[PDB]
RNA sequence: GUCUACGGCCAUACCACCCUGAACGCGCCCGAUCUCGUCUGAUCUCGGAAGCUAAGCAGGGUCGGGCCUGGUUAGUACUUGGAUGGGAGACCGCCUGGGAAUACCGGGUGCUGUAGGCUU
RNA sequence: CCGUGGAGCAGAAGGGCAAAAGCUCGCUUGAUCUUGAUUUUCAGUACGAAUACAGACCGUGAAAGCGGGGCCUCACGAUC
RNA sequence: GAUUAGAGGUCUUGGGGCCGAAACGAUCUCAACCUAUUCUCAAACUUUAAAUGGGUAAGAAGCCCGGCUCGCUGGUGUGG
């Protein structure tokens, strides 16, 4: 025959990886270089920006590591955009930009630093970096945590990075992964980046659908038709969303509703139950076999 | 041809087995470690007798073989050709060395391999005989006359276990009747109350 | 009843030709393969050096390509038409995939060019199921469970029912 | 003319008959071997 | 004679524990060492940068300098008939806070607190840790059951 | 009661098979104009929302394997210090202290930090 | 499809290593200039080797960072 | 890494035969193989793992307050 690979010795000698590595969620090799502060800085926090693009949502958080577990100081979710105006299209590059800007403004507004470091109020999509103003508190600084995402040109993590940078946070970066960088010419097209930020790359797609096909367009953008969004008005609604975000970035928690205390999953049965079960299984097998014989 | 056995009786060196470091070791003379009707079940040879060492020493592989031959000869003479089962429970793994003299002297005096011996502790079994209940004095006499092929002092002990097993003979039969151990080959398998119920059903069906 | 989308679909079809020596034969085999598959195939270097087959270390000795979707079922239909929808019990693997070979290529709808010559090839199909991308995606990889995987019997049933073929014993 | 190669037979007695004294621990240990830029800071702070 | 290699005879000392190979847990990197902490040395073979010499393995020293990735510590080494307090630089992986000092610190806080308290009360309280005193007199009550005899068992051979 | 994002300790968390998942979510899933990358839109990247808990995932089950923690083995093995103890030796006994590990037999099968949801 | 490393990492051996220290690509020359401190043999002297820094010029990456030779343990030389 | 012995499975192959044109169709077998067991081992093996032993601490150079300096680190008279 053949050896059994998953042998008792195999399990005895097997060493499991970390839980996050087993679930595939964390790259500890990158985390070690990302979240570790220099020893002569002592307990100076090393803030970092976590951006995670989900199948239906964008998660943006600000976190610094602590022994019992890293603590989140500010967080912003893409599904909060309908409050500010973006009713649909919660995953695209524009939505990433708005959620990053919202996270930045929320941090500063919590943090008492709005009148300083306004950043790029007028979006340009070019290389911008904030400088600390003398006689005033220094600009907030953090580093991007791309996670397991492939950092190729035009990634929505970099879109969120640009959004927060225009918001006012000081994050080191280069205009190489923004949409618009042309590898061959090694140049940056701020206008192309701006149109990607404002969502024109979806507007021309919908107009392209208008050009030839209608049912395919409905299939591709069903909720767009239901929410009554047209290709031309997307730039205006994104501008309005940016204005509303910069106006009122504070977050209010939803009121808590009392629980009815209903258990939805099976509880763990006890030793007495699981022993009675095997006892009666043996009794039943014996009583069945004594007749079947 | 070989040096007297008194020159290698005490466990004076660390165990020096044959391995990738100790090469060129001549083959030990003893190759067969059990004989008789070894292809017998566990319920026909209940009586078990051990020869137990009383000294901490090292026994030569060849002396092991000589004692085995003597015991087998007496057993085939007494209890028939297949009324017993021998088992030598000592394998020679510690090789000994010799620094032969042909005149360098004691320079570079690390020996070449000469033979193999087995290190024996106090109260350790050397040979075991399993047979029927009635051949008790036959077993005792066979082991007694095999004692003369060994150095040091040895004792004969009629074990209270059943055959070559680790279970007491005075409830071995009760336990096998109750089906707590299942016979196989020349031994038994313990069946604890821990496996999946499928095995329990299989062996109670 | 049934789950509407636990059904069986082919997820990739692999074509290969192993010529055993680099050169004009190899590039012409690549040409016929790319004409058949509508895309550029790739060369595979020899893993080791064995002189019984007259090959050495790291030279291209085989040309292979993979297809998905529309072109995949068209090529598979051509191959099964050549093989008159006839397969054997041992042609199916334990994991649900299967395959076969064509001794020469111009029968399945390829014009005979005397310069390129003649070449056989191996067809292989990997039966899939919606959700098999979990086993190979990057972020949160995992197994595909026990119920969801494909067995030899399910592959046989799918082949005999969708393409009304016959599985002769052998 | 062989001879003994190495030993430490009397060494413990020789050490102990004068006693293995611990290093002279004392406050205000020297600042040599400290990070240069932190040292430069401490000098600036003391200066001002 | 022997070899003067820097890692001679460390195949077990610098090895990893059973079923504990792999990525170093980040809590070791996320600890704070200041000037003057008492700290333990335990060489870890997973990282080879800044590995302490084998003679300081298992020794306890005092931190005197903190740097980006490593720490300088003063530790005593017995050389022949004299002890030298020498300072070595160890990367942060091979280091660990000593718990022998925190017990004394907690004891200091606690007996200082109980000295501050009862100062107004005027009562007496013991602070010095006295050694284990001899057991005092007491009564052992039998509950009507007499103690059972103990006798040696007869010799009878097992092997 | 429970999930997601980031985690700490890294199997009491793993492995095999089976049963159940309300809502949100996570997913599977639908396409390749744009960004991006491949022999292949399979992976990666991007644009979505017709369908589904099938799978992942979560909870539970197995006289389950493993793992963790106890009892037994056992005051056994070994061992600090002592004797003008025994023995031809090999070794052993005692006094003064410390004191294991298999087999075998029990119990358990993730805790928890920050932020944000669902159970109106 | 299974596969905790049973392979590979130039060489002896040992330690270490799995989205890596292994394999394949892209770009480069931190194998560069410079003052000190420390460890290893030690007399606590040199050479050799090594470790943390600091000051410039750089490389790479989106970045955090990493890099002043080889994953570590050996591969080398006073005065005139 | 060495090492003895029997048990149960199959065609996974080989060896003696046998009915078979042949047929994993079939008969014994001997084997190699697999699964549970079993005897005996390691200075250059090890999951475990002592006794003896090697460091460190057992306060005034310590704790608790208030305030200054810093060109370092700094969301923050933050951290040090
Ligand atoms: Mg990375
Ligand atoms: Mg003579
Ligand atoms: Mg000797
Ligand atoms: Mg002499
Ligand atoms: Mg001398
Ligand atoms: Mg797709
Ligand atoms: Mg599911
Ligand atoms: Mg299900
Ligand atoms: Mg169990
Ligand atoms: Mg939680
Ligand atoms: Mg209700
Ligand atoms: Mg890498
Ligand atoms: Mg530098
Ligand atoms: Mg390298």
From Swiss-Prot, chain A:
Say where the cross-link Glycyl lysine isopeptide (Lys-Gly) (interchain with G-Cter in SUMO1) occurs: 218
Phosphoserine modification sites are 183, 270
Modification Phosphothreonine, positions: 230
GO terms, molecular function = 5S rRNA binding; structural constituent of ribosome
Asked whether the keyword Cytoplasm is assigned, the reply is: yes
Could you list this entry's UniProt keywords, alphabetically sorted.
Acetylation, Cytoplasm, Isopeptide bond, Nucleus, Phosphoprotein, Ribonucleoprotein, Ribosomal protein, RNA-binding, rRNA-binding, Ubl conjugation
Q: Which GO terms describe its biological process?
A: ribosomal large subunit assembly; translation
Composition bias type Basic residues, residue spans: 256-266
List modified residues, type N6-acetyllysine.
3, 46, 218
Cite the SUPFAM superfamilies for this sequence.
Translational machinery components
InterPro entries given in the database record: Rbsml_uL18_euk, Ribosomal_uL18_C_euk
Compartment(s) where it occurs, according to its Swiss-Prot or TrEMBL record: Cytoplasm; Nucleus, Nucleolus
Span of the signal peptide: none
- Region called Disordered, residue ranges: 251-293
Record bears the keyword Ribosomal protein:
yes
Superkingdom is: Eukaryota
**Any one GO cellular component localisation term in the record:** cytoplasm
UniProt lists the family membership as follows: Belongs to the universal ribosomal protein uL18 family.
Function text? Component of the ribosome, a large ribonucleoprotein complex responsible for the synthesis of proteins in the cell. The small ribosomal subunit (SSU) binds messenger RNAs (mRNAs) and translates the encoded message by selecting cognate aminoacyl-transfer RNA (tRNA) molecules. The large subunit (LSU) contains the ribosomal catalytic site termed the peptidyl transferase center (PTC), which catalyzes the formation of peptide bonds, thereby polymerizing the amino acids delivered by tRNAs into a polypeptide chain.
Query: What is the protein named?
Result: Large ribosomal subunit protein uL18
According to its UniProt entry, this protein's organism is: Oryctolagus cuniculus
Quote the gene name from the UniProt entry: RPL5
Swiss-Prot record, chain B:
Tell me the keywords, alphabetical order: Citrullination, Cytoplasm, Developmental protein, Isopeptide bond, Ribonucleoprotein, Ribosomal protein, Ubl conjugation
Report what the Swiss-Prot or TrEMBL entry states about this protein's PTMs. Answer: Citrullinated by PADI4.
Q: Give the Citrulline positions (modified residues).
A: 31
Cross-link Glycyl lysine isopeptide (Lys-Gly) (interchain with G-Cter in SUMO2) mapped to chain = 166
UniProt GO cellular component terms = cytosolic large ribosomal subunit
> Which biological process annotations from GO are given for this protein?
regulation of translation; translation
InterPro entries (UniProt xref) = Ribosomal_uL16, Ribosomal_uL16_CS_euk_arc, Ribosomal_uL16_dom, Ribosomal_uL16_euk_arch, Ribosomal_uL16_sf
MF term (GO), any: structural constituent of ribosome
Cross-linked residues for Glycyl lysine isopeptide (Lys-Gly) (interchain with G-Cter in ubiquitin) are 179
Protein family per UniProt: Belongs to the universal ribosomal protein uL16 family.
Query: How is the quaternary structure described?
Result: Component of the large ribosomal subunit. Mature ribosomes consist of a small (40S) and a large (60S) subunit. The 40S subunit contains about 33 different proteins and 1 molecule of RNA (18S). The 60S subunit contains about 49 different proteins and 3 molecules of RNA (28S, 5.8S and 5S).
Q: What is this protein called?
A: Large ribosomal subunit protein uL16
Source organism of the structure: Oryctolagus cuniculus
Q: What is the lineage of its organism?
A: Eukaryota, Metazoa, Chordata, Craniata, Vertebrata
Swiss-Prot record, chain C:
In terms of PROSITE patterns, this protein maps to: RIBOSOMAL_L5 (PS00358)
Residues annotated as transmembrane: none
Q: Could you name the domain of life of the organism this protein comes from?
A: Eukaryota
Modified positions (Phosphothreonine) are: 37, 40
What Pfam families does UniProt report for this protein, alphabetically?
Answer: Ribosomal_L5, Ribosomal_L5_C
UniProtKB keywords:
Acetylation, Cytoplasm, Isopeptide bond, Nucleus, Phosphoprotein, Ribonucleoprotein, Ribosomal protein, RNA-binding, rRNA-binding, Ubl conjugation
* Broad class of the protein's primary localization: nucleus
Cross-link Glycyl lysine isopeptide (Lys-Gly) (interchain with G-Cter in SUMO2), where in sequence: 31, 45, 147
Residue numbers carrying N6-acetyllysine: 45, 78
A Gene Ontology CC term for this entry?
A: nucleolus
- Gene Ontology MF terms: rRNA binding; structural constituent of ribosome
The record's subcellular locations are: Nucleus, Nucleolus; Cytoplasm
Which InterPro entries does this UniProt record tie to the protein? Ribosomal_uL5 (IPR002132), Ribosomal_uL5_C (IPR031309), Ribosomal_uL5_CS (IPR020929), Ribosomal_uL5_dom_sf (IPR022803), Ribosomal_uL5_N (IPR031310)
Any one biological process term the GO annotation gives? translation
Subunit note: Component of the large ribosomal subunit (LSU). Part of the 5S RNP complex, which is a LSU subcomplex composed of the 5S RNA, RPL5 and RPL11. Component of a hexameric 5S RNP precursor complex, composed of 5S RNA, RRS1, RPF2/BXDC1, RPL5, RPL11 and HEATR3; this complex acts as a precursor for ribosome assembly. Interacts with PML. Interacts with MDM2 (via its RanBP2-type zinc finger domain); negatively regulates MDM2-mediated TP53 ubiquitination and degradation. Interacts with NOP53; retains RPL11 into the nucleolus.
Q: Which family does it belong to?
A: Belongs to the universal ribosomal protein uL5 family.
State the name under which the record lists this protein. Large ribosomal subunit protein uL5
Tell me the organism.
Answer: Oryctolagus cuniculus
Recall the taxonomic lineage recorded for the source organism: Eukaryota, Metazoa, Chordata, Craniata, Vertebrata
Curated annotation (Swiss-Prot), chain E:
Keywords linked to the UniProt accession: Cytoplasm, Endoplasmic reticulum, Ribonucleoprotein, Ribosomal protein
Where, subcellularly, is it found?
Answer: Cytoplasm, Cytosol; Cytoplasm; Endoplasmic reticulum
> Where is composition skewed (Basic and acidic residues) in this entry?
111-122, 135-144
* Gene3D superfamilies referenced in this protein's UniProt entry, alphabetically: 6.10.250.3260, Ribosomal protein L21
Q: Which domain of life is it from?
A: Eukaryota
Q: Which Pfam family, giving just one, matches this sequence?
A: Ribosomal_L21e
Q: One of this protein's GO BP terms?
A: translation
GO molecular function terms here?
structural constituent of ribosome
**GO cellular component terms attached to this protein's record:** cytosol; endoplasmic reticulum; ribonucleoprotein complex; ribosome
Primary localization class, coarse: cytoplasm
Q: Where is this region: Disordered?
A: 111-144
| SUPFAM superfamilies from the UniProt entry | Translation proteins SH3-like domain
Q: List the disulfide bonds.
A: none
Subunit annotation: Component of the large ribosomal subunit.
What job does the chain carry out? Component of the large ribosomal subunit. The ribosome is a large ribonucleoprotein complex responsible for the synthesis of proteins in the cell.
**Annotated family:** Belongs to the eukaryotic ribosomal protein eL21 family.
The entry's protein name is Large ribosomal subunit protein eL21
Native organism = Oryctolagus cuniculus (Rabbit)
């Amino acid at each position: 025959f053949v050896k059994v690979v998953k042998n008792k010795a195999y399990f005895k000698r097997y060493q499991v990886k970390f839980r996050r590595r087993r679930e595939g969620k964390t790259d500890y090799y990158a985390r070690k270089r990302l979240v570790i502060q220099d020893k002569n800085k002592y307990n100076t926090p090393k803030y970092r920006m976590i951006v995670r693009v989900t199948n239906r949502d964008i998660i943006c958080q600000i976190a610094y590591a602590r022994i019992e577990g890293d603590m989140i100081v500010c967080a912003a979710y893409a599904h909060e955009l309908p409050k500010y105006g973006v009713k649909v299209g919660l995953t695209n590059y524009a939505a990433a930009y708005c959620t990053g800007l919202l996270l930045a403004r929320r941090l500063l507004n919590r943090f008492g630093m709005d009148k300083i470091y306004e950043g790029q109020v007028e979006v340009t999509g070019d290389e911008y970096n904030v400088e600390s103003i003398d006689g005033q508190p220094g600009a907030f600084t953090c580093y991007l945590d791309a996670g397991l995402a492939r950092t190729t040109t035009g990634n929505k993590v970099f879109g969120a990075l640009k959004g927060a940078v225009d918001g006012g946070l000081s994050i080191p970066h280069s205009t190489k992964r923004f949409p618009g960088y042309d590898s061959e010419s090694k140049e940056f097209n701020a206008e192309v980046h701006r149109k990607h930020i404002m969502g024109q790359n979806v507007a021309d797609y919908m107009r392209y659908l208008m050009e030839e096909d209608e049912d395919a367009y409905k299939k591709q953008f069903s909720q767009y038709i239901k929410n009554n969004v047209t290709p031309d008005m997307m730039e205006e609604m994104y501008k309005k969303a940016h204005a509303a975000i910069r106006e009122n970035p504070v977050y209010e928690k939803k009121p808590k509703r009392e629980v009815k205390k209903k258990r939805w999953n099976r509880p763990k049965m006890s030793l007495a139950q699981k022993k009675d079960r095997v006892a009666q299984k043996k009794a039943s097998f014996l009583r069945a076999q004594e007749r079947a014989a | 041809g070989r040096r007297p056995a008194r020159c290698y009786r005490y466990c004076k060196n660390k165990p020096y087995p044959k391995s990738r470091f100790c090469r060129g070791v001549p083959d030990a003379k003893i190759r067969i470690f059990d004989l008789g009707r070894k292809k017998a079940k566990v319920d026909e040879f209940p009586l078990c007798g051990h020869m137990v060492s009383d000294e901490y020493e090292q026994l030569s592989s060849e002396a092991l073989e000589a004692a085995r031959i003597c015991a087998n000869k007496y057993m085939v003479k007494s209890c028939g050709k297949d009324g017993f089962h021998i088992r030598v429970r000592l394998h020679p793994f510690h090789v000994i060395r010799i620094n032969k003299m042909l005149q360098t002297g004691m320079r570079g005096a690390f020996g070449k391999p000469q033979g193999t011996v087995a290190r024996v502790h106090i109260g350790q079994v050397i040979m075991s005989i399993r047979t029927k209940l009635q051949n008790k004095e036959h077993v005792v006499e066979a082991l007694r006359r095999a004692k003369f092929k060994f150095p040091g002092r040895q004792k004969i002990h009629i074990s209270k276990k059943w055959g070559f097993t680790k279970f007491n003979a005075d409830e071995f039969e009760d336990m096998v009747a109750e089906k707590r151990l299942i016979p196989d080959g020349c031994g038994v398998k313990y069946i604890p109350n821990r496996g999946p119920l499928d095995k329990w059903r299989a062996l109670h069906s | 009843k049934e789950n509407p989308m636990r059904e069986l679909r082919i997820r990739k079809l692999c074509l290969n030709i192993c010529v055993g020596e680099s050169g004009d034969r190899l590039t012409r085999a690549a040409k016929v393969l790319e004409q058949l598959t509508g895309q550029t195939p790739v060369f595979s270097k020899a893993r080791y050096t064995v002189r019984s087959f007259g090959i050495r270390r790291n030279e291209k000795i085989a040309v292979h390509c993979t297809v998905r979707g529309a072109k995949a079922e068209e090529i598979l239909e051509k191959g099964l038409k050549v093989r008159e929808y006839e397969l054997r019990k041992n042609n199916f693997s334990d994991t649900g995939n299967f395959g076969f070979g064509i001794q020469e290529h111009i029968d399945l709808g390829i014009k005979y060019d005397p310069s390129i010559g003649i070449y056989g090839l191996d067809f292989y199909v990997v039966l899939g199921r919606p959700g098999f991308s979990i086993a190979d995606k990057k972020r949160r990889t995992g197994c595909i469970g026990a119920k969801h995987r494909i067995s030899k019997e399910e592959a046989m049933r799918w082949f005999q029912q969708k393409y009304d073929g016959i599985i002769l014993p052998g | 003319a062989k001879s003994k190669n190495h030993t430490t037979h009397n060494q413990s007695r020789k050490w102990h008959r004068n006693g293995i004294k611990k290093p002279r621990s004392q406050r205000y240990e020297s600042l040599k071997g400290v990070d240069p830029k932190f040292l430069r800071n401490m000098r600036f702070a003391k200066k001002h | 004679t022997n070899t003067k290699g820097k890692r001679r005879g460390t195949r077990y000392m610098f090895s990893r524990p059973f079923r504990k190979h792999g990525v170093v847990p980040l809590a070791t990197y996320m600890r704070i060492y200041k000037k003057g902490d008492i700290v333990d040395i335990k060489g870890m073979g997973t990282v080879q940068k800044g590995m302490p010499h084998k003679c300081y393995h298992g020794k306890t020293g005092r931190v005197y300098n903190v740097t980006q990735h490593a720490v300088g510590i003063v530790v005593n080494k017995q050389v022949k008939g004299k002890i030298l307090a020498k300072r070595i630089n160890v990367r942060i992986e091979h280091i660990k806070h000593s718990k022998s000092r925190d017990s004394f610190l907690k004891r200091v806080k606690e007996n200082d607190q109980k000295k501050k308290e009862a100062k107004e009360k005027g009562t007496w309280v013991q602070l010095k840790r006295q050694p284990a005193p001899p057991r005092e007199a007491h009564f052992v009550r039998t509950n009507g059951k007499e103690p059972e005899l103990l006798e040696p068992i007869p010799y009878e051979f097992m092997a």
